[PDB]
């Protein structure tokens, strides 16, 4: 997105009824921090929610 | 019995990936430490070089 929210008024978007290749995000060089909790980023492509 | 010195350059952001059990562009596609690695990882900013 061209402009993000302020953190006090942080945005939320439902992601639903779709297929996510999280490995595009995870092995992108762009993100300086990519920390997962309660899940492993590699196995994230094997899960559903 | 021996010491193996491995040496290379990366981004400052990516130094966090040079650790056992890490994942990411460098940890996955460039250089992987074993999860039970014994050794030390030594890094310094080389912007002047």
| B26: Cβ contacts below 8 Å, ≥ 6 apart | B10, B14, B17, B18
CB neighbours of residue B14 within 10 Å: 19
Q: Helix, strand, or coil here: A22?
A: helix
Which of A24, A30, A32, A35 to probe the B interface (max B CBs under 10 A)?
Answer: A32
Residues of A in contact with B31 (CB under 8 A): none
- The answer to whether the beta carbons of residues B18 and B27 sit under 8 Å apart is yes
Which H helix or E strand runs over A49? none
**Cα A18 vs. chain centroid, distance in angstroms?**
14
Residues in A closer than 8 angstroms to B35, CB to CB, are none
Contact assessment for residue B34 and residue B47, using Cβ atoms and an 8 Å cutoff: no
> Which technique was used to obtain these atomic coordinates?
cryo-EM
Q: What is the resolution of this structure in A?
A: 2.8
Say which of B11, B13, B25 has its CB closest to residue A27. Answer: B25
Neighbours of B26 (CB within 10 A): 21
């Amino acid at each position: 997105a061209t402009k993000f929210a302020s953190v006090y008024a942080w945005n939320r978007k439902r992601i639903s009824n779709c297929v996510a290749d999280y490995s595009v995000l995870y092995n992108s060089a762009s993100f300086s921090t990519f920390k997962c909790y309660g899940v492993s980023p590699t196995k994230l492509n094997d899960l559903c929610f | 019995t021996n010491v193996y010195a491995d040496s290379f350059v990366i981004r400052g952001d990516e130094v966090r990936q040079i650790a056992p059990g890490q994942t990411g562009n460098i940890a996955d596609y460039n250089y992987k430490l074993p999860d039970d690695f014994t050794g030390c990882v030594i890094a310094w900013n080389s912007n002047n070089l």
